Design a protein around this motif. Sequence first.
Motif, PDB file in Angstrom:
ATOM      1  N   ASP A  32      53.988 -40.538  27.919  1.00 39.04           N
ATOM      2  CA  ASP A  32      53.114 -39.696  26.966  1.00 39.04           C
ATOM      3  C   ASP A  32      54.034 -38.563  26.097  1.00 39.04           C
ATOM      4  O   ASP A  32      53.703 -37.195  25.973  1.00 39.04           O
ATOM      5  N   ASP A  33      54.992 -39.049  26.012  1.00 43.86           N
ATOM      6  CA  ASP A  33      56.054 -38.297  25.016  1.00 43.86           C
ATOM      7  C   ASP A  33      55.603 -38.768  23.605  1.00 43.86           C
ATOM      8  O   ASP A  33      56.568 -38.438  22.270  1.00 43.86           O
ATOM      9  N   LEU A  34      55.378 -40.024  23.311  1.00 47.95           N
ATOM     10  CA  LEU A  34      54.899 -40.712  21.368  1.00 47.95           C
ATOM     11  C   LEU A  34      53.528 -40.225  21.619  1.00 47.95           C
ATOM     12  O   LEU A  34      52.544 -40.362  22.133  1.00 47.95           O
ATOM     13  N   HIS A  35      53.372 -39.191  19.926  1.00 50.02           N
ATOM     14  CA  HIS A  35      52.049 -39.282  19.230  1.00 50.02           C
ATOM     15  C   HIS A  35      51.679 -39.895  18.430  1.00 50.02           C
ATOM     16  O   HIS A  35      52.814 -39.474  17.178  1.00 50.02           O
ATOM     17  N   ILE A  36      50.627 -40.532  17.939  1.00 51.89           N
ATOM     18  CA  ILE A  36      50.779 -41.629  16.775  1.00 51.89           C
ATOM     19  C   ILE A  36      49.331 -40.400  15.946  1.00 51.89           C
ATOM     20  O   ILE A  36      48.473 -40.252  16.315  1.00 51.89           O
ATOM     21  N   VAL A  37      49.539 -39.722  14.422  1.00 53.94           N
ATOM     22  CA  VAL A  37      49.154 -39.766  14.053  1.00 53.94           C
ATOM     23  C   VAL A  37      48.675 -40.445  12.367  1.00 53.94           C
ATOM     24  O   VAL A  37      49.568 -41.201  12.149  1.00 53.94           O
ATOM     25  N   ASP A  38      47.695 -40.225  11.699  1.00 49.37           N
ATOM     26  CA  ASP A  38      47.397 -40.468  10.506  1.00 49.37           C
ATOM     27  C   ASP A  38      48.215 -40.146   9.273  1.00 49.37           C
ATOM     28  O   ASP A  38      48.735 -41.041   9.018  1.00 49.37           O
ATOM     29  N   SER A  39      48.067 -39.047   9.678  1.00 50.82           N
ATOM     30  CA  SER A  39      49.322 -38.639   7.992  1.00 50.82           C
ATOM     31  C   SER A  39      49.997 -36.343   8.487  1.00 50.82           C
ATOM     32  O   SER A  39      48.963 -36.126   9.756  1.00 50.82           O
ATOM     33  N   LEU A  40      51.056 -37.224   7.904  1.00 44.94           N
ATOM     34  CA  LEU A  40      51.739 -35.891   8.191  1.00 44.94           C
ATOM     35  C   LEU A  40      51.191 -34.286   7.727  1.00 44.94           C
ATOM     36  O   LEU A  40      52.141 -33.189   7.063  1.00 44.94           O
ATOM     37  N   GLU A  41      50.125 -34.317   6.253  1.00 41.15           N
ATOM     38  CA  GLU A  41      49.761 -33.279   6.196  1.00 41.15           C
ATOM     39  C   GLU A  41      49.547 -32.167   7.321  1.00 41.15           C
ATOM     40  O   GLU A  41      48.685 -32.345   8.328  1.00 41.15           O
ATOM     41  N   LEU A  42      49.749 -30.795   7.145  1.00 40.54           N
ATOM     42  CA  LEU A  42      49.749 -30.089   7.312  1.00 40.54           C
ATOM     43  C   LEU A  42      48.945 -28.993   6.148  1.00 40.54           C
ATOM     44  O   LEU A  42      49.026 -28.792   4.802  1.00 40.54           O
TER      45      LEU A  42
ATOM     46  N   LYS B 143      67.409 -37.121  22.273  1.00 44.53           N
ATOM     47  CA  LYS B 143      67.398 -35.783  21.563  1.00 44.53           C
ATOM     48  C   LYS B 143      66.490 -35.247  21.772  1.00 44.53           C
ATOM     49  O   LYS B 143      66.155 -34.229  22.533  1.00 44.53           O
ATOM     50  N   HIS B 144      64.618 -35.967  20.950  1.00 43.75           N
ATOM     51  CA  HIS B 144      64.002 -35.186  20.866  1.00 43.75           C
ATOM     52  C   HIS B 144      62.771 -35.152  22.152  1.00 43.75           C
ATOM     53  O   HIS B 144      63.029 -37.019  22.432  1.00 43.75           O
ATOM     54  N   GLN B 145      62.325 -33.899  22.819  1.00 41.62           N
ATOM     55  CA  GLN B 145      61.484 -34.153  23.817  1.00 41.62           C
ATOM     56  C   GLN B 145      60.426 -35.341  23.547  1.00 41.62           C
ATOM     57  O   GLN B 145      60.249 -36.753  24.196  1.00 41.62           O
ATOM     58  N   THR B 146      59.522 -35.469  22.172  1.00 41.73           N
ATOM     59  CA  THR B 146      58.382 -36.045  21.550  1.00 41.73           C
ATOM     60  C   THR B 146      58.314 -36.192  20.277  1.00 41.73           C
ATOM     61  O   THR B 146      58.842 -35.831  20.298  1.00 41.73           O
ATOM     62  N   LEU B 147      57.690 -37.550  20.305  1.00 37.43           N
ATOM     63  CA  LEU B 147      57.703 -37.800  19.093  1.00 37.43           C
ATOM     64  C   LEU B 147      56.369 -38.697  18.394  1.00 37.43           C
ATOM     65  O   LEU B 147      56.208 -38.846  18.750  1.00 37.43           O
TER      66      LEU B 147
ATOM     67  N   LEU C 210      55.376 -51.448  34.963  1.00 37.84           N
ATOM     68  CA  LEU C 210      54.473 -49.737  34.155  1.00 37.84           C
ATOM     69  C   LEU C 210      53.844 -49.101  35.255  1.00 37.84           C
ATOM     70  O   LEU C 210      54.164 -47.951  34.154  1.00 37.84           O
ATOM     71  N   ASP C 211      53.166 -49.155  36.088  1.00 44.04           N
ATOM     72  CA  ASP C 211      52.734 -47.564  37.040  1.00 44.04           C
ATOM     73  C   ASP C 211      54.492 -47.117  37.239  1.00 44.04           C
ATOM     74  O   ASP C 211      53.667 -46.099  37.190  1.00 44.04           O
ATOM     75  N   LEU C 212      55.103 -47.765  37.919  1.00 38.23           N
ATOM     76  CA  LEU C 212      56.170 -45.968  37.849  1.00 38.23           C
ATOM     77  C   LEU C 212      56.926 -45.687  36.474  1.00 38.23           C
ATOM     78  O   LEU C 212      56.998 -44.654  36.907  1.00 38.23           O
ATOM     79  N   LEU C 213      56.458 -46.772  34.986  1.00 36.04           N
ATOM     80  CA  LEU C 213      57.084 -46.036  34.236  1.00 36.04           C
ATOM     81  C   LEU C 213      56.502 -44.872  33.931  1.00 36.04           C
ATOM     82  O   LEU C 213      56.802 -43.492  33.796  1.00 36.04           O
ATOM     83  N   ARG C 214      54.095 -45.026  34.099  1.00 39.21           N
ATOM     84  CA  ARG C 214      54.033 -43.951  33.575  1.00 39.21           C
ATOM     85  C   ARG C 214      54.284 -42.183  34.885  1.00 39.21           C
ATOM     86  O   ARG C 214      53.968 -41.265  34.224  1.00 39.21           O
ATOM     87  N   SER C 215      54.130 -42.736  35.831  1.00 37.75           N
ATOM     88  CA  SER C 215      54.644 -41.144  36.246  1.00 37.75           C
ATOM     89  C   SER C 215      56.157 -41.056  37.029  1.00 37.75           C
ATOM     90  O   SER C 215      56.070 -39.777  36.589  1.00 37.75           O
ATOM     91  N   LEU C 216      57.179 -41.384  36.119  1.00 38.14           N
ATOM     92  CA  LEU C 216      58.562 -40.890  35.943  1.00 38.14           C
ATOM     93  C   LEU C 216      58.328 -40.200  34.801  1.00 38.14           C
ATOM     94  O   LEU C 216      58.059 -40.440  33.960  1.00 38.14           O
ATOM     95  N   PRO C 217      59.313 -39.066  34.898  1.00 40.41           N
ATOM     96  CA  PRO C 217      59.510 -38.260  34.448  1.00 40.41           C
ATOM     97  C   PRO C 217      59.952 -38.117  32.961  1.00 40.41           C
ATOM     98  O   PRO C 217      60.600 -39.672  32.998  1.00 40.41           O
ATOM     99  N   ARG C 218      60.468 -37.614  31.440  1.00 38.27           N
ATOM    100  CA  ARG C 218      60.738 -37.943  30.545  1.00 38.27           C
ATOM    101  C   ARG C 218      62.407 -38.047  31.004  1.00 38.27           C
ATOM    102  O   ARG C 218      62.925 -37.240  31.582  1.00 38.27           O
ATOM    103  N   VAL C 219      62.830 -39.040  30.617  1.00 37.49           N
ATOM    104  CA  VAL C 219      64.037 -39.369  30.472  1.00 37.49           C
ATOM    105  C   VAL C 219      65.137 -38.381  29.311  1.00 37.49           C
ATOM    106  O   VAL C 219      64.824 -38.258  28.362  1.00 37.49           O
ATOM    107  N   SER C 220      66.389 -38.453  29.997  1.00 32.30           N
ATOM    108  CA  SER C 220      67.167 -37.016  29.552  1.00 32.30           C
ATOM    109  C   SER C 220      68.087 -38.458  28.463  1.00 32.30           C
ATOM    110  O   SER C 220      68.869 -39.465  29.011  1.00 32.30           O
ATOM    111  N   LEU C 221      69.655 -37.512  27.753  1.00 32.95           N
ATOM    112  CA  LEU C 221      70.512 -38.201  27.217  1.00 32.95           C
ATOM    113  C   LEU C 221      71.584 -37.680  28.331  1.00 32.95           C
ATOM    114  O   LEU C 221      72.494 -39.279  28.374  1.00 32.95           O
ATOM    115  N   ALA C 222      71.325 -37.420  29.258  1.00 34.21           N
ATOM    116  CA  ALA C 222      72.013 -37.274  29.922  1.00 34.21           C
ATOM    117  C   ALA C 222      72.089 -38.013  31.449  1.00 34.21           C
ATOM    118  O   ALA C 222      73.216 -38.975  32.371  1.00 34.21           O
TER     119      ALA C 222
END
Lengths: 132, 93, 97, 214, 249
Positions: D112-122, D182-186, E4-16
């Motif tokens: 749940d770190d990826l956000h699909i958007v139609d356009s970037l316009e603000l 490096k970025h938390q969400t995309l 996949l069920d394991l992946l959703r529960s797991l928190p965001r991974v980091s570079l370290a």
Amino acid sequence: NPGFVESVDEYQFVERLLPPTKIPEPPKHKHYPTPSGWQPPRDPLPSLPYFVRRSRMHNIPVYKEITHGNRQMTLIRKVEGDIWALQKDVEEFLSPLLGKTPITQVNEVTGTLRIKGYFDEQLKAWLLEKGF
Amino acid sequence: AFVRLTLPPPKVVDRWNEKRALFGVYDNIGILGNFEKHPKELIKGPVWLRGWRGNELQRCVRKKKFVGNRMFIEDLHNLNKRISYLYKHFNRH
Amino acid sequence: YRAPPPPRRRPGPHSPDPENLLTPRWQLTPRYVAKQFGRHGAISGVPPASLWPTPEQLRELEAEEQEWYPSLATMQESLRLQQQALEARRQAREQRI
Amino acid sequence: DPVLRKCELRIPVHRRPVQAWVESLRGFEQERIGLAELHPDVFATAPRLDIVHQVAIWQRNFRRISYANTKTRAEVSVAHGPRGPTSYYYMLPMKVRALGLKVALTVKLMQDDLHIVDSLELPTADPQYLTELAQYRHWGSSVLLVDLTHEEMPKNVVAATSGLNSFNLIPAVGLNVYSMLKHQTLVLTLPSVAFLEDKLLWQDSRYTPLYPFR
Amino acid sequence: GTSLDLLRSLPRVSLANLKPSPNSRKRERRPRDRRRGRKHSFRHQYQPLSLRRLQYLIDLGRVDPTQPIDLTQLVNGRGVTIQPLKRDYGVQLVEEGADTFQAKINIEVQLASELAIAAIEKNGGVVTTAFYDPRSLEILCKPIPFFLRGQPIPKRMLPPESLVPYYTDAKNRGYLADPAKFPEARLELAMKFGYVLPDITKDELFRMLSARKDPRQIFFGLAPGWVVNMADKKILKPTDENLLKYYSS
């Protein structure tokens, strides 16, 4: 006065010569199996927990491998679903033909199964029976 | 031995600066650019080792050929003498 | 921050300056000029008529063809001579043995 | 009118399509405006993070050049010290590199770190609006914005993203594993998803390249 | 997919969090401590294509059955790997796969097996052998590069006197063979197997199957000495009489 005359009529050959980048899908055949022996995946596909997809060439993903120059092996790579269920069925199928429980190692991380000895022919035929 | 009686000055590092934040961008130029430009083409450094790697002797030899016409006489002679010692060790021992 | 513009290689014909000392010799050869035409064709601007061999070049090519490359008739004659020599060799072996 | 997207390429029969919520940046509460379909072979690949690990090392170490040097006894007017400029450049297989990018996309979507958007316009170029909207939508401290091409990217977004250290805007061709990690969400535009899928899905087959594509 | 069920529960991974794969890197030894303290060219390099290898290409539709089999199309279809640095000079077939290859089609191969020729002819295919110079063949495999160079289409070369007998031989079905013998030869091959000879003329596509380019002509589509407007995707024909004399020479 140019020394050259340009015509589009004969360029069809040049268009044919253009190189392809994506392998085309196999053409439909009136009768299967094909005279060479190729047959597309059986329809309907089996409802087993584990699905084995065909290779990009639409071939069975079974490869005969030898290591240390003395250990014959066969490897199945494109296994989808429950690998354990496939191993149980594979162990059951090969135990009579082999005469004993086959010696195998399961690489779950890579989703691959390694079996000592060469048994691709029997497995490939058996895979067809499953409907893959 | 005797050691410092004072702490070194504190250092603050910004991990989201433009250089660190944008490091690596366009590293997929080949796949995302139709492979028109190879990622090796993005290497910045000495001319004789852009898109190429080798051992020190190979690097030194390649350096001599690339800028030999632009190398100083003193530097060129020194490089030749060093190469002579390196050649014997690698190619005879 | 916003990323800088992507690096792009310049397209289209580019003519090296012949007078410049730095430019390599091979980049000033007619083969390079022919290379320019191949890449862009008419956009290069190279006259297609120039691509064909010059009359002095043509004469040299004709001499090479005749001097080193035999015609079919010449080849056929050589086969006949070799066959005759082979036939004589066979007869000599038979009479000798 | 829901915005409904379907995969241009043929999805495998045995694999069902993946779906996600389409979003817009026009308003704070415009979180959901449509539902889109994602190719399972791209957004539902196996979670092979070692490839991602290898890609990160390759990305950092293929540009690495060390300029450390020391003089030996013959060069004095270190017995085993650094000797001149050293390079660590190496190339990973093309197929592996493509797979690594694919794996990263799955991780962000599944997490749940990826956000699909139609356009970037603000609506406005004020950086405050962008940051507040991220807070409203519970986005991560760092948000990565991707557009299809650098030339056509909206002016309003450029001003806000340029002035934000933790919110970075890159073109589609500049996407890489390192930035995504490096970025938390995309944040990905709809055209970018189609652009990415084509190259990734094009990798099928080999027809080995007899010469470089340059 | 419970994975996949394991992946959703797991928190965001980091570079370290990144960690090298198990057994990926072996240990290294360094002298920091006591541990490391103290202490044939003339003969053509014929490359064969098996009949069984031939059959699957037709079965998979890798090469269009309608189009006559052409070496370039095989190169375009990646049927065989040819390296100019290897200096491959010849193309042939493998005797294996005779009874698994039931097909009829027009084909041209630098070398063809006498037994194989009849079998494909028995099916109804047309087989001949043509000579491509190793330098010309390398150009033939890669047409675009010489266009970039600007080179024009040259006349196709002829075999050396050592290989002239093979191509000139009627049974070998070379382009140097006498056409008058082909009708007689085709009947003889049919009698050898005994199969009823199917006349090529009867075939609807007879002209397409039987079409053959001139010995000087490298390309059936393109006559020798021609030029190609690669930029305009067109073909350019020389209009100079002296060029015709050059080609005649």
